[PDB]
């Protein structure tokens, strides 16, 4: 029983962390192979941070100006080449630590797993998912750029997510492996907000439905309702519309519960409509929506 | 800035599991060197779980009698023996990933990391701390006996927790790493109960500082209180009686703040007595408490 924030095991990331340094700028990158992949940025100076032309700052480099270090052990750069937002450098060496792998984008709403490191080091790891505005409320410091997010199938590390730059409201923007910006946020010193955010009320099911799983199940109640006057009530707490996929791929969790989707949708509007009264559920005092239904699986079966 | 439920990077940790089998029983165990540490009720038959006498169940059994297995390796057990709860495996290979490691116990209020294993193979990490109760709310399933907890500094793994067994209200026992319970808890199926629970007051003097370090500041007033008033109203509302050490531990982070300590214990009554208002906290709806001073000093500083 109990139900956790977890986060895949951070090993296979952790042998493929190093630094990457051009001239005083320093970040982390990710050594798969014999390519190591780090946000772009890495390439500007303090001048050049506020409004690069990357192209231009790119072709006055050489394999030289790039210092990557593997702990102590420094590889040597080989070739060099900008991938959108993502500089590739070629070493003379694969990483036998290298896992299988894949670069994968994710959805909002979808979690996985960050390895928040520090001058190629790794400092730690939590959950995160990405928000309807491509943002994610990670936890950052200054150094943290080119830290990774992913998760893992079968010894299989698929790598989602490599940080670049937190908002001015402390939440965070990057790429995918292939350089590409999760949302409308470019790799520069702007002033870039944030669009607006919604609920992910699938995931919000799936966490009463771990909840039920675990013995909490004072907010139930033999009430129903049907989808469109739920999302009625959804639109107007800011909730993501709930859909027949939904509705779908909650199926596993309604059976070994028992209690039918709709039941718990239910069961979400009047939480909605009257809060909690002081009651908890598995902990929390707000309905949480960073557990996807997978998350929920993997813990509660 | 960010403030997430932070695990260690369990790499170092993931390198020691394995897994253990006496007859049809099994679990994990934690290989160092070449010793194999695993819980001692694994020697229990199904028949022998209610009542064991340990002694005379290991008096029984030869070295054959226990199946180790690192991935697919099978690891020759070269001697048996029991300490206290814990059953110590000597084998004829010394584990090559053995990080630095030191056994430590911990104290109630202290937090670690968590890497829940099933079958001898890692299958998530997360945060856990342990309660003045002695039992920690933690996620395992079956088959998640000998999983470890562990603190890391400087590449030292200081272990302190081997995971035992769930009491019934859902919350977890175990031991130290010298096989000695946390608590009035035996390893024997009887129904046990987790004694009465406080909060964590120094922990969630820690949180509201991260709070304001990541810029949550409504809860803060001009008011100030005394430490003995304070814990007038911590005892009311059953939270640990805050002492001048604890006082003193918040030093640093009612620097950096420049919030005194008491202050943040006026913020704190406030709190108590009236509620948070629809109002969150670093995304929680209640008052946290197990983040330590020094979790919050390691990411926010
Ligand atoms: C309470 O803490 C508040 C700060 O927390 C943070 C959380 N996440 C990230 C950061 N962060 C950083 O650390 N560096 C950081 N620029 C840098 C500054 C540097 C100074 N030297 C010597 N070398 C440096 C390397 C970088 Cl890259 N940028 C800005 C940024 C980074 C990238 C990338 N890639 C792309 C575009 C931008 C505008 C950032 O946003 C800070
Ligand atoms: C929603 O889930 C509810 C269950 O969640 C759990 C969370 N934590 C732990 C458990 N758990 C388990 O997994 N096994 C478990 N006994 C076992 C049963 C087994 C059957 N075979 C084939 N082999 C087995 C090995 C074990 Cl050890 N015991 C009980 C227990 C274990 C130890 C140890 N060491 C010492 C004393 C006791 C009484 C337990 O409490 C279950």
Redesign the pocket.
């Known amino acids: 029983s109990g139900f956790r924030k977890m986060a895949f095991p951070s090993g296979k990331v952790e042998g493929c962390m190093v630094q990457v340094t051009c001239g005083?700028?320093?970040?982390n990158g990710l050594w798969l192979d014999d390519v190591v992949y780090?946000?772009?940025?890495?390439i500007?100076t303090?001048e050049d941070?506020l409004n690069p032309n990357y192209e231009d700052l790119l072709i006055r480099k050489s394999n030289h100006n790039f210092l990557v270090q593997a702990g102590n052990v420094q590889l040597r750069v080989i070739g060099h080449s900008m991938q959108n937002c993502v500089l590739k450098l070629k070493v003379d060496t694969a990483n036998p630590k290298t896992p299988k792998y894949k670069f994968v984008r994710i959805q909002p709403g979808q979690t996985f797993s960050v390895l928040a490191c520090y001058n190629g080091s790794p400092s730690g790891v939590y959950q995160c998912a990405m928000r309807h505005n491509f943002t994610i409320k990670?936890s950052?410091?200054?150094?943290?750029?080119?830290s990774v997010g992913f998760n893992i199938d079968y010894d299989c590390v698929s790598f989602c997510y490599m940080?670049?730059?937190?908002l001015p409201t402390?939440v965070?923007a990057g790429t995918d492996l292939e350089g590409n910006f999760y949302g409308p946020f470019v790799?520069?010193?702007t002033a870039q907000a944030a669009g607006t955010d919604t609920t992910i009320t699938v995931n919000v099911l799936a966490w009463l439905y771990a909840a039920v799983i675990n013995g909490d199940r004072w907010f139930l109640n033999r009430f129903t309702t049907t989808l469109n006057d739920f999302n009625l009530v959804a639109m107007k707490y800011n909730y993501e519309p709930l859909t027949q996929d939904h509705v779908d791929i909650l199926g596993p969790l309604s059976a070994q519960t028992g209690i039918a989707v709709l039941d718990m949708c239910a069961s979400l509007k009047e939480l909605l409509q009257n809060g909690m009264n002081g009651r908890t559920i598995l902990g929390s005092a707000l309905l949480e929506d960073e557990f996807t239904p997978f998350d929920v699986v993997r813990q509660c079966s």
């Open positions: 005083t700028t320093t970040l780090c946000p772009r940025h890495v500007c303090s941070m990670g950052f410091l200054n150094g943290s750029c080119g940080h670049h730059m937190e402390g965070h790799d520069r010193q």
